[PDB]
Specification:
- Keywords: Cell projection, Cholesterol metabolism, Endoplasmic reticulum, Heme, Iron, Lipid metabolism, Membrane, Metal-binding, Microsome, Monooxygenase, Oxidoreductase, Steroid metabolism, Sterol metabolism, Synapse, Transmembrane, Transmembrane helix.
- One of its GO terms (molecular function) is steroid hydroxylase activity.
- InterPro entries: CYP46A1, Cyt_P450, Cyt_P450_CS, Cyt_P450_E_grp-I, Cyt_P450_sf.
- The chain has helices spanning about 10-25, 40-50, 60-65, 85-95, 100-105, 105-120, 130-150, 160-180, 180-215, 225-230, 240-250, 255-265, 270-285, 295-300, 300-310, 345-350, 390-405, and strands at about 25-30, 35-40, 65, 70, 130, 320-325, 325-330, 330-335, 340-345, 405-410, 420, 425, 430-435.
- With about 450 residues, it is α+β, with helices and mostly antiparallel strands.
- The chain binds protoporphyrin IX containing FE and ligand A1BZE.
- Ligand A1BZE binds near residues 250, 251, 254 and 386.
Length: about 450
């Protein structure tokens, strides 16, 4: 009853889109079994995301914190909603995402991208179907594990299948917790719970190896794990460390994979844009196998294509803030203690904010084009924006540039362009393609 006065009805994000269009900038919805208010004016996005006064609503992150009674991300960087506790860990972990830190990762990005392209080139017979979703997820995982933890997962070589299965089931668990046959319930619970335990045990094992390497005086390059450890200096137990281990293990590859998959999917029906991209990579990097850091800024058209991919297909569709006190938002009285839902997915597909919103047009992000003002936020905005944004943008440019340099992709007929909402948004189908060398 406290929300019944708010406009509203008498993937789920498309239903929200329809309702925002019909009912306006402030609409009551039910999401993850709780009443929320979707706020879609740019004035609101600015007000709430650009102030440290407004913090995340913990209740809407419960499925990341713990699933079926197993601690998952716990109080790591994404799911910690207390400002002071978040701030302390953010400032320490930020050191691993410095300009100098990120420049040193180019070798890893290049090596894993080159490995992917070589594997794909051997299958480029115009006939063999290849799941680009799977290949790009393995590439993202292998990049993350090496870059962040000094670990070789070698998923591109077909290694670590138990780990890959663990990740899949954990993501299914997050999804089931936020939605949802007795025999079905039993096996599901068992497999999800054991997968989460496996992931934290991977953390424990790798932290032990790192500590042992340091004690023996071995060479350990400073990385994300260094700063995750530094954040926990003098903690009473290792649960905080393992929260962030798992947070970065998953966050550091899943969304990047989703974004790569969506971009490959969309480009399969954009032959003219693909031709322009091919020309750009040919002109900027030539025959070089390796992209230098300075080359990345020169791939201007690719940058624009990637921005446009995130407008229509943001893997993380939005964020929540807790409204503590009753507040008038765009003419609507919103009671205190209410989760406010912000969605870059919904705003990206609204004609009020983007002309011909379903048209894929990289020119929207061109040098002379007016920039979206608080209508576009695939990495979010403000203090709780993505710590990995520049890491992600670099890795995906490296991977895409090397694909475009060497291969042509055709989507297998019957493959769909639709989305599914699991723990993130991702393509519904495996992005099955046939390949030829350029
Ligand atoms: C295209 C790739 C990526 C997209 C679209 C993306 C998107 C986002 C979004 C929308 C948020 C805000 C989430 C929220 O408010 O609940 C976020 C936060 C975060 N992301 Fe990313 N992300 C990407 C890549 C990465 C990578 C590569 C890493 C780590 C290496 C990463 C680690 C994080 C962490 C730790 C947070 C929490 C930040 C904080 O609250 O201080 N993400 N991401
Ligand atoms: O679950 C998330 C969320 C947000 N960010 C992430 C990331 C992430 C960020 N950067 C890299 O990865 C990874 C995942 C994971 F499932 F893959 F683990 C989930 N999330 N939520 C958003 C939208 C609905 C829900 C609650 O509100 C805010």
């Amino acid at each position: 009853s406290r929300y019944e006065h708010i406009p509203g009805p008498p993937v789920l994000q498309d239903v929200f889109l329809d309702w925002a269009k019909k009912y306006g900038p402030v609409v009551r919805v039910n999401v993850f079994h709780k009443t929320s208010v979707i706020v879609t004016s740019p004035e609101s996005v600015k007000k709430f995301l650009m102030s440290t006064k407004y913090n995340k609503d913990s209740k809407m992150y419960r499925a990341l914190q713990t699933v079926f009674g197993e601690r998952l991300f716990g109080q790591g960087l994404v799911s910690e909603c207390n400002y002071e506790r978040w701030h302390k860990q953010r400032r320490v972990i930020d050191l691993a995402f410095s300009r100098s830190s990120l420049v040193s990762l180019m070798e890893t990005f290049n090596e894993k991208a080159e490995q992917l392209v070589e594997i794909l080139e051997a299958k480029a017979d115009g006939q063999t179907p290849v799941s680009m979703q799977d290949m790009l997820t393995y590439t993202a995982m292998d990049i993350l594990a090496k870059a962040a933890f000094g670990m070789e997962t070698s998923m591109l070589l077909g290694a670590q299948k138990p780990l890959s299965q663990a990740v899949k089931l954990m993501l299914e668990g997050i999804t089931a917790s936020r939605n949802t046959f007795l025999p079905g319930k039993r096996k599901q619970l068992r497999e999800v719970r054991e997968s989460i335990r496996f992931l934290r045990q991977v953390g424990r094992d790798w932290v032990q190896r790192r500590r042992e390497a340091l004690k023996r005086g071995e060479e350990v390059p400073a990385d994300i794990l260094t700063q995750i450890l530094k954040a926990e200096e003098g903690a009473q137990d290792d649960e905080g460390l393992l929260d962030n281990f798992v947070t970065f293990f998953i966050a550091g590859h899943e969304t990047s994979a989703n974004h790569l998959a969506f971009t490959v999917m969309e480009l399969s029906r954009q032959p003219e844009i693909v031709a322009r991209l091919q020309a750009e990579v040919d002109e900027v990097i030539g025959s070089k196998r390796y992209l230098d850091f300075e080359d990345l800024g020169r791939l201007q058209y690719l940058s624009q294509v990637l921005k446009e991919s995130l407008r229509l297909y943001p893997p993380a569709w939005g964020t929540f803030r807790l409204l503590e006190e009753e507040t008038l938002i765009d003419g609507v009285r919103v009671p205190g203690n209410t989760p406010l839902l912000f969605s870059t997915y919904v705003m990206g597909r609204m004609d009020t904010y983007f002309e011909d919103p379903l048209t894929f047009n990289p020119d929207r992000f061109g040098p002379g084009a007016p920039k979206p003002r608080f209508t576009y936020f695939p990495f979010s905005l403000g203090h709780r924006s993505c710590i990995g944004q520049q890491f992600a943008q670099m890795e995906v440019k490296v991977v895409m540039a090397k694909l475009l340099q060497r291969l042509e992709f055709r989507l297998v007929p019957g493959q769909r362009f639709g989305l599914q909402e699991q723990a993130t948004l991702k393509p519904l189908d495996p992005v099955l393609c046939t390949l030829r060398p350029r």
